[PDB]
């Protein structure tokens, strides 16, 4: 395929996987 097209394919194929796995306030205190 080549360097430029494959870079966009791999980046796009990764981002479709993440929105399958996807389907608060930070802990300011450390001792409960």
């Amino acid at each position: 395929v080549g360097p430029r097209l494959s870079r966009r394919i791999l980046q796009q194929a990764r981002q479709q996987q993440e929105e399958l796995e996807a389907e608060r306030e930070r802990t300011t205190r450390l001792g409960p």
């Binding site: 930070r26 802990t27 300011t28 205190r29 450390l30 001792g31």
Partner: protein, 220 residues
């Protein structure tokens, strides 16, 4: 007189601040005065943007000479300004935790159970993926915090390892080269120092380990 020396640290003139910054370090490292000066440090952060940079520089090399309760209070206070998205205060506070762990404090200064609360708290930042300025410093302290936690209690040390190696493998995908070099340099120094001498006490591990050997299953 100690409070007279200390109250000039917030001074706007840099020369007056620079000597007072160096003066406080030499007095404490050379302690009953440690408790009061930390109480000054916490209240000054709560009062306030430019002065906080000088105070985090004060807290940079003054965390190691603190007792447990004040480290626990400081660990909150350094973590409060993390909620602010300002970058220079974030980097100094990130580097402040570095000087805490790089000194490798004793059991009276830093307890073993305190470090577990710190590392579990720091997991909530992971800045985005690819900014390279704090992310090198972020995984520098997670190296330094874990290597210190292992030295105190080793079998708990393997307990917290798999989650860090979850992000460390994941953060290899950042497009910056210096992320890649710093990441594996962190990971190799954990393995050469926290796992290699303590491997013999673990013994042989199967696929159905239960104790700390199960951590080694999660490493690989």
């Amino acid at each position: 007189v100690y409070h007279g020396l200390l109250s000039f640290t917030v001074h706007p003139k840099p020369k007056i601040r620079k000597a007072a910054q160096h003066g406080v370090c030499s007095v404490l490292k050379g302690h009953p005065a440690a408790i009061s000066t930390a109480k000054f440090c916490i209240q000054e952060i709560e009062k306030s943007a430019t002065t906080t940079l000088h105070m985090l520089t004060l807290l940079k090399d003054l965390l190691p000479c603190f007792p447990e309760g004040l480290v626990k209070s400081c660990s909150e206070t350094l973590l409060r300004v993390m909620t602010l998205s300002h970058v220079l205060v974030t980097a100094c506070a990130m580097q402040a935790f570095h000087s805490l762990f790089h000194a490798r404090p004793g059991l009276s200064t830093l307890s073993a159970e305190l470090n577990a609360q710190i590392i579990t708290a720091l997991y909530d930042y992971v800045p985005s993926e690819n900014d390279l300025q704090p992310l090198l410093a972020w995984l520098k302290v997670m190296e330094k915090a874990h290597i210190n936690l292992v030295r105190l209690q080793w079998d708990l040390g393997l307990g917290h390892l798999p989650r860090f190696f979850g992000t460390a493998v994941t953060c290899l995908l950042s497009p910056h080269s210096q992320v890649l070099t710093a990441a594996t340099q962190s990971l190799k120094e954990i393995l050469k120092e926290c796992v290699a001498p303590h491997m013999a006490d673990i013994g042989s591990v199967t696929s159905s380990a239960s104790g700390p050997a199960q951590s080694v299953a999660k490493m690989f």
